[PDB]
Design an enzyme around this catalytic site. Structure first.
Site, PDB file in Angstrom:
ATOM      1  N   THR A  36       2.616   1.851  -1.227  1.00 44.05           N
ATOM      2  CA  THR A  36       2.618   2.993  -2.134  1.00 44.05           C
ATOM      3  C   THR A  36       2.865   4.298  -1.391  1.00 44.05           C
ATOM      4  OG1 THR A  36       1.123   1.857  -3.658  1.00 44.05           O
ATOM      5  CG2 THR A  36       1.293   4.244  -3.843  1.00 44.05           C
ATOM      6  N   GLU A  37       2.255   4.466  -0.217  1.00 47.65           N
ATOM      7  CA  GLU A  37       2.396   5.721   0.513  1.00 47.65           C
ATOM      8  C   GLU A  37       3.775   5.867   1.146  1.00 47.65           C
ATOM      9  OE1 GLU A  37       0.428   8.248   0.491  1.00 47.65           O
ATOM     10  OE2 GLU A  37      -1.116   7.255  -0.711  1.00 47.65           O
ATOM     11  N   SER A  38       4.348   4.780   1.667  1.00 41.14           N
ATOM     12  CA  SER A  38       5.605   4.908   2.398  1.00 41.14           C
ATOM     13  C   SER A  38       6.677   3.892   2.039  1.00 41.14           C
ATOM     14  CB  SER A  38       5.347   4.828   3.909  1.00 41.14           C
ATOM     15  OG  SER A  38       6.560   4.918   4.635  1.00 41.14           O
ATOM     16  N   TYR A 138      -2.447   6.839  -9.573  1.00 45.66           N
ATOM     17  CA  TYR A 138      -2.603   6.162  -8.293  1.00 45.66           C
ATOM     18  C   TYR A 138      -3.531   4.960  -8.425  1.00 45.66           C
ATOM     19  CZ  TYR A 138      -2.508   5.913  -3.191  1.00 45.66           C
ATOM     20  OH  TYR A 138      -2.307   5.518  -1.889  1.00 45.66           O
TER      21      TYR A 138
END
Lengths: 196, 186, 49, 124
Positions: A36-38, A138
């Site tokens: 999700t972050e990268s 999120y």
């Protein structure tokens, strides 16, 4: 990028199992958070654009207790120590929320303070209306791989009828996109080579 | 509902609409279709259309930046060929042109020269090797290139220093350009 | 103010409603600037022979 | 209502609509939905759309001015490097170019020179 690619041939995952066993975090949660972050993208360009797998910010990087002031202006570029620090933070968050609550620990996304404490209080009360849109989205993105007592109350939030389920933006807006017309296929030059 | 439809990011608008649906569930606690659930279904369809229009712009901007990166890669390949001993032109007007690059500009060469100098400066090698690499790039450069323009200030300053010294009949206390050029000559 | 309650109940859709200030009705509607103060950097041709 | 929808500033249009709602409250003194309150709800929605279109133009103009300020900052940095003894070109054709600057012009150097001379003249 669809359905997070759970069973894709696992690229560069020789680090998540070790961090998970060292800190106690679930492997699936850590891998999903990294995706999700990268999205496992080596460039990860944004307003700040940390190319590391854990797309941190300077304030969080310094608050993590690392030696970030080293190397190319930031020390959390080598994947292993950044991933280990993220796993330690996630384990500390999960442990401190009275059990295996794997979704209140998503204070990881919002932090604790002026903008994170009231949202966590609202989550404790089960009042998802006081949680921000970013936090709600999120947490929605992690429903597939998470163990929480309120995982069923969050999915039945925002339905068209009280017996319906809310639709995450990753599903309602899924499939809508446009391809890039520019590719990395470069033109090639030739040397004027006459060997007389 | 109308304010949720005037957000710049469709992903935020979708979650705002989910919140509004949750609010409406407390005043219409049944399953039938009402004229107020039609509001929300239409709003979600409009947000999908907005997502389409948003992905247009995102893809276009990404293409615009990727063309610049491709042009820098092409220039780097051309200097690499020239340094190795091949007979190619390192002028930006003679770079190969594609649909993935577009037309080249002088600012492309300026950016490439600055980036290359910084990258050479960031290497973990002794200073002699860095000087050798910089001089290789200077030698491979074209007549009006950026590498030759950066060092042309040194030559202009050194010539001015010598001519002014001859006119005034005395060397100044500092001649940094002449010293730098003499060291590069050495 | 003694008229702080009379001003808020001015402009409501019904006589029992409250008026909406523009800072609330138009809140959240805006666009980000695409230009930032992140400047390009130049490098000196420094060869110390 | 139509004249309130033809204002250039949406913030003024919103307050005009609030005034019109206050006027209407004196002839429809109840809580039900009438075809005249629908007028005002639609007008407020239209004003929100106008606010979106207005923020477009405001952001674009601010970006246009900020690019010029960024170009002046880049030129100032280049002269500062050159004066300190570094070998860089102070020609406007050789300034580094970004997405936050665009392409440089001769008038940029003219403006920088005038501004620098004035700033030096204002020193104590």
């Amino acid at each position: 990028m669809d359905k997070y690619d759970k069973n894709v041939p696992s690229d560069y995952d020789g680090l998540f199992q070790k961090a998970a066993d060292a800190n106690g975090v679930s492997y699936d949660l850590l891998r999903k958070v990294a995706w999700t972050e990268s999205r496992f993208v080596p460039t990860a360009k944004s307003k700040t654009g940390p190319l590391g797998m854990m797309q941190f910010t300077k304030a969080t990087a310094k608050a993590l207790g690392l030696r970030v002031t080293d190397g190319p202006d930031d020390d959390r570029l080598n994947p292993e120590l950044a991933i280990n620090a993220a796993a330690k933070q996630l384990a500390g968050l999960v442990g401190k929320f009275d059990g295996d609550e794997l979704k209140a620990a998503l204070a990881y996304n919002q932090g604790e303070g002026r903008l994170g404490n009231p949202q966590l209080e609202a989550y404790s009360k089960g009042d998802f209306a006081s949680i921000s849109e970013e936090g709600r989205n999120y947490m929605r993105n992690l429903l597939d791989v998470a163990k929480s007592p309120m995982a069923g109350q969050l999915e039945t939030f925002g339905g068209i009828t009280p017996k319906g389920k809310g639709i995450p933006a990753e599903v309602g807006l899924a499939g809508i996109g446009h391809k890039q017309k520019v590719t990395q296929e470069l033109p090639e030059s030739t040397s004027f080579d006459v060997k007389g | 509902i109308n304010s949720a439809l005037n957000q710049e990011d469709p992903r935020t608008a979708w979650e705002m609409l989910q919140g509004i649906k949750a609010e409406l569930d407390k005043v219409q606690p049944d399953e039938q279709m009402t004229p107020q659930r039609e509001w929300l279904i239409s709003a979600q369809e409009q947000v999908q259309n907005q997502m389409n229009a948003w992905t247009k712009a995102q893809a276009k901007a990404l293409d615009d930046s990727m063309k610049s990166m491709n042009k820098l890669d092409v220039i780097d390949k051309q200097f690499q060929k020239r340094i190795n001993g091949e007979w190619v032109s390192t002028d930006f007007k003679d770079m190969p042109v594609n649909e993935n690059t577009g037309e080249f500009k002088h600012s492309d060469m300026v950016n490439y020269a600055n980036k290359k100098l910084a990258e050479i400066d960031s290497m973990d090698i002794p200073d002699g090797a860095k000087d050798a690499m910089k001089l290789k790039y200077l030698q491979a450069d074209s007549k009006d290139g950026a590498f030759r323009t950066a060092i042309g200030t040194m030559v202009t300053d050194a010539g001015q220093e010598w001519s002014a010294a001859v006119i005034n009949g005395k060397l100044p206390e500092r001649t940094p350009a002449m010293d730098a050029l003499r060291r590069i000559r050495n």
